[model samples]
Target chain A: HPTFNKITPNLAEFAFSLYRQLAHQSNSTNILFSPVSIAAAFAMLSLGAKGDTHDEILEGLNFNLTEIPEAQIHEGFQELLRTLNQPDSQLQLTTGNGLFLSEGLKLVDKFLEDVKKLYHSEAFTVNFGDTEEAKKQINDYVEKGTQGKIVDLVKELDRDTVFALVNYIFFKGKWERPFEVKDTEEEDFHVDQVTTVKVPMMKRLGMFNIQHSKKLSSWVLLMKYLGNATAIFFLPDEGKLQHLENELTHDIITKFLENEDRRSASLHLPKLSITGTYDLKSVLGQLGITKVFSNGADLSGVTEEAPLKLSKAVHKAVLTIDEKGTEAAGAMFLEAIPRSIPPEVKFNKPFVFLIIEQNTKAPLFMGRVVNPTQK
Target chain B: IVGGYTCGANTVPYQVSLNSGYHFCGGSLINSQWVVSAAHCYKSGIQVRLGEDNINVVEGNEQFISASKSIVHPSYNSNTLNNDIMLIKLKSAASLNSRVASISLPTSCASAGTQCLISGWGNTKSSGTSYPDVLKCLKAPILSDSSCKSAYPGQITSNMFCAGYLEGGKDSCQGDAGGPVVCSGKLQGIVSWGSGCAQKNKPGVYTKVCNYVSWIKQTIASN
Candidate 1:
């Protein structure tokens, strides 16, 4: 892997840039995945590339090659890991990367060092002949890594698969002012125009940073956590979800964040349990990184013992939410007290959301929840 | 509570169905020009149909009229639904006859265990699409105020009273708001709110008519 002289690039832009592409590709109404997870996984995978094969994969990751060198890109990721995995943080957040190699093939020493050095992946050597056992081990590793949140992320492992790369993120943060359990009441979740499912919708009457965006025809709410994180919830107008997605660009989000004001509100948000399981083969190809999966691939830099080509690529994420927040807190405010009944913000319909680190603006996880009551 | 039977003719002559589109609330005709209902049921331009027994059918004795002025209790709170009482003045006086008449306002509160009559065009079941087109009637014994306080815990206000079963076999369902809860041939309770229709241990909460009698008379005399 090319090491940067030293520079840092924006994973924020890359994350939002992939939003439109991923949303259009998968028609599933519900999604919850870490953008950094896929980017970091592909970052480690690109360590095996040489020539245009490596270039395509890197460009496919939403990086401008002219502005930033490969070394700085890896360095930027290395720095991200250092802060993210910082010990004794208030938030429970950890991202992991790994490579599961077959016993028959030997990976080049330089590529192995790059994976471990830059991506911090724990390289695993497994025998793919016993596909079930190999899948179990990979799942086991990820299961423990994410604290049992993602237990079965390796369901489609083939016997011929030699290299299985994986990455995952687990984030556990508390609401700055956790809602009272008694406030959670059974409310209607409008699944569609004609259908509604009963869901335990959480309620909170508090001061929140929010905005009613006429541009997107949506209400943007920032739910701050006790730690350095916030969950930004977007409730589009009834029957305007598709329009919201089309107009929801990176700049639109950025502008909202800058202009949003702290206001009193009565928010009704459902307890969330959303998962995003994606096969990266087809989805990744549409982003202009096709050569890596082809026979003429130049993964010769990864292993000289046998020619290497990308096979099945899998990425998955899980987000669980409830009344509890990151730390011990209650009523830590002296500002605006609720009066005249603050505007009631209901996430009763299908809504979009993104959980990001406060300072870095890194989207820890993002998705649209169509049915919180179902999952 | 989805615990009611169909009402026979003259069973609830004062019972009326308030319609926004379909049956939104049920009301009681207290006088020729005055109707008593729940404050939560008040909607601008809502039409009141007196002498309504069957909601879906066009009964011959039905009197269709709109409210010229609606008065919700000043202390009514949507959060707790406290003081959930409203008096609507009709566009014109309803024609009083065999199918339409006024129920008297109670001079005092009824004792606990006094069975009250609940009649409305609300849902016949707790959930689903089992709505009753004909006005339904249920017999529910009024419970003590303390019993209701324990059931809802911090939700029951002085202006509200409870009537129905704790085990939940018989009670009024949704669309019964503002309907009459008649006890001893007088308007005793007005269907205000509850946890759900006919829920177990959850009884039908009604606005205490005796508590609002003076306010009702005063509002009517002045308005």
Candidate 2:
């Protein structure tokens, strides 16, 4: 039982909503994003937001202000961030909100303090006139935070740009039953019916938690990490990725998470280093978070005299995958009789993966890997 | 060939080398047109070579043929390496001569303590530290299923058996997979998998060929 089960659901609703929009909007077959990353960003943004903008951002994140008060939402996030920041031996993860403000701007003292307190965010002043230096400083900050998984996260900046609200989530975890690097072999990954790419498929013959979700029409594979997290993969039947994506919900995910049983299996999953960068300005605009980015914005909560409008918001995230399951050779001594012929489960096609912190059930990351060899 | 010795020319006439460009696995020339190996050793565009002593140099006694039709056991499990035997139909039959010939299949399962000859051009050290060009052979004694069960815990199946010293030193390693485990001039087992080559208490595991005799005869009779 996860303690913050209440708050993470709102995050999951927001995650799936953003995923569907991104899937519908993008022409690329693969899509990846960090919902909690974007959700935390807007939560900080909503601090400077007034009336409509604040309600819209929170509501758009699937939070009902009437049911759960605004203060409780911030506290839920505070608890969520705190729980995630606890020393996880198995996972290497860093997530937080960051703000890059122009030299002249003066944000409200209360808002700055609250953003720091609730979102674990920090505000830094930069000279937007020198876009190169501004970009470097921010990227450098993100690089250090994510342990270099995301270098140069702030790809570019406008010279006149005054405000930048950045959010990033970086995650790396080792498997419990790690695949031997020597076992990695070349295999064909069917990107679709017609397209194929050769990939170095990582293999491990060990016990895994898996099940066929009849309702979702997919094989759910749950690979455990050393600590509190597990990597859940949804491998849909050929030509049924869209169907799985369509029927996906947090409830479905939770059901599968609790339902699957561990059994001996041969896994052939491609090593992945998939990444995604999204312009949250447009993405949030479609989600009715329009006022915050518009010129008619009332970020007056942040600045009263400057007539400041939230110019650009970029959310960048990166995830690296390998068979680095941590050590325990003696534990791998499996049973002989009860265990029968193990199934060979291959993820040589497009599939969805979600990394959840089982203790808190935090939907930390979600994405679709269409061609793992590409990145 | 983790803890093995080099073999003389034509010493192991039943030996077969399964290669794509270079040897990745081993097999046995059970008959003129049929080669037997491990199911997990299957590779795309795999070619079979027979009557070869040294893999580096081409001996005129050797014959190279690709698989015309490959057949893996229906119940073979790649995960557990259970029922791991596979049959390869040679594109063309080998000419039986001084260096090239087939070995007989076992009528009964070799009992515990049976001395077996396992041969391949596998690595001399574990995890591919070095591979030998000449065929290497190890003489290991068959261990009881109970001993094998204690060694590997849950991995040993009814279709599988174990051989090699329990105190450990002499055993086959990588590239020995799918190669022959011959006892008393008959194919008794096929090298399938193990923990590590020549490790104490971790013997070389093989697919029990005595159990697959019916399947082998039926497959050959029909195909």
Candidate 3:
């Protein structure tokens, strides 16, 4: 049995700040990380990454930075290293931002050492910059960290990494009392109460702590713990999702878990999992943290002209909860944003008219008239 | 919210025979002058006979209206089968009588499984290919979009709609393609396409007339 522990308030704040920052800088070039992924990562890290090595374990997902031609891996590495050393300082490096081979080697050595210290766990590792040399260093660190059992974990690091260090991690496991796959039945899922459709549904009949609370209309929340960290799923009553959606904040979630009661109740839970990949730059912007990935960002660490700047941040996450417990994996990566690319537009035929609802923004009606004259 | 504002039942049946002495399909009278027919019935030389229930010979004070011009939706691609709608502009607006009134177009455009009626002069059974002189109305339910998409991947474009029986054998045939498939006495869909008149998993597809309200209004206003 695993016990629940409260996460340090500072880490929680940093997670939110990072989320905001990534959202701000995201646009056509980069995506902010998924909020779910960030939360899942923080949970797994707090739990202490240890369990059966081969068994399904909670791990971080994948994050892709940049995929461009002129990405300078060395300068990108130096800029990231500088950001770590001076968290408040900004660094930038342009495509032509030159770096001596010797200086590049020094930056790699420093980054590898810091990564080992900060993320000292057997579950996952980080890549400061992906290069042939970087790959060699990552393999060496993984080999030494796992006592040579896990020799080469970095499976396919390609040219895309030159523009950005695409980071990913794999983790898997089954529910303690797995939902009987054979018992899966087709059931009706309501998009809205009035609009329902039949969909494949998997259910688990297990004893879980159920309680009635004023927080939501006929709400159901399931709690699962991995070591000391916990994952809580809040399911609002039908048609009441928006109410709870408005109240879903980091503080709200943290508070609910902190003040939960331990009791056993009959729980008929749905067996489900979702995999999501998102760009974090825009979401971060929406959250009010700006400047780091924007035009005026003071990233002078990598070059004198501030040529190299963080271009993109990507995140991917997978979530699954069941009778045994819950496991989720997520990953985040930052890549130096690239130079502006050209736009493409093509129009060949008479345009179709579409009028969408302002509130719902869905196309209420669509029509195509050969002659615009008739109504 | 109004009773009798739907397409099924309460609809007056009328036959439209072309000038070539070949009878085409059935349609509902919306106004004195305007008669709504399927887009496919808009060929260069076509005449409409209203107020007549029989096609072989005109009978019973039936009104004959000659279409001066035909307007088919510009986006109507017979191959891709989009915008399967059209309106017939009469030489002059006909005098409105209670029995010759037009059905109103619906606003909600409800989802699949909603009960509706499709009236047509096309073949009654799946095996029959000839259009029937006596207009026939059949009961059916609109199918879900996923069901339609799977049944006919390339035929079910977003603009076109669908409704029919899941068990098959009850639907409109070739000439019925452009006719009206009404529900609750309101004009809902325009009969369009399917693998056959009716087959399992293949419901009759139609053009959502309500979806083209704007185009209908604009076209009517311009002309």
Top candidate by DockQ? 2
Candidate 2, residue A142: CA error in Å? Answer: 9.1
lDDT of 3: 0.43
TM-score-based ranking: 2, 1, 3
Collision pairs in model 2: A175-A325, A335-B154, A336-B154
Give the per-residue Cα lDDT of candidate 2 at B54.
85
B20-64: candidate 2 lDDT, tens digit per residue: 778878899888999999898876677898888888897778889
Top candidate (lDDT): 2
* DockQ (CA atoms), all models: 0.02, 0.04, 0.01
Candidate 2: stretches off by over 4 Å: A1-35, A47-79, A87-92, A98-225, A229-290, A299-308, A311-375
Best by TM-score: 2
* Model 3 CA deviation exceeding 4 Å by range: A1-375, B1-19
In terms of docking quality, model 1 is: incorrect
* TM-score result, candidate 3: 0.35
Please state the error at residue B52 of candidate 3 in Å.
1.8
User: Against the true chain A, what TM-score does chain A of candidate 2 give?
Assistant: 0.93
TM-score, model 1, chain B versus true chain B:
0.96
lDDT per residue as tens, model 3, A11-70: 234344453343334211212122322333222222222222101111111111123111
Residue A337 displacement (Å), model 2: 19
